[PDB]
Design a protein around this ligand. Structure first.
Ligand SMILES: O=C1CC[C@H](N2C(=O)c3ccccc3C2=O)C(=O)N1
Ligand SMILES: [Zn+2]
Length: 105
């Protein structure tokens, strides 16, 4: 249990070693304006995503960061968001925990 893959298709996405404690915890539970709850795991790094459009600050869960939707680059599943335009770190990924599968490298 060291790498994270897209639950829907198996695309390689991230690694346990790349988890990022933002504000003291890599896990943040948040809601969007439609009331959907997301258990977000922050990672310093991810791969195999497709980042959609240009960044927006609207409703951002992380102060100082603008977001872009991150889809699985293979199957198009919404896996989370890429955050940028902030400070220490400038960028990171917030991925929806239950949309990933964890397993051996
Ligand atoms: O940091 C974030 C990422 C974007 C996220 N987001 C949503 O998941 C969403 C769904 C529908 C309409 C508008 C939004 C919105 O800004 C949100 O609420 N905060
Ligand atoms: Zn996928």
């Amino acid at each position: 249990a060291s790498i994270f893959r897209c639950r829907q298709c198996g695309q390689t996405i991230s690694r346990r070693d790349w988890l990022l404690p933002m504000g003291g915890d890599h896990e943040h539970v948040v809601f969007n304006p439609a009331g959907m709850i997301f258990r977000v795991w922050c990672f310093s790094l991810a791969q195999g995503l497709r980042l959609i459009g240009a960044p927006s600050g609207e409703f951002s869960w992380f102060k100082g960061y603008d977001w872009t939707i991150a889809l699985c680059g293979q199957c198009g599943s919404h896996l989370g968001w890429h955050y940028e335009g902030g400070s220490q770190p400038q960028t990171f990924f917030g991925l929806i925990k239950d949309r990933l599968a964890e397993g051996p490298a």
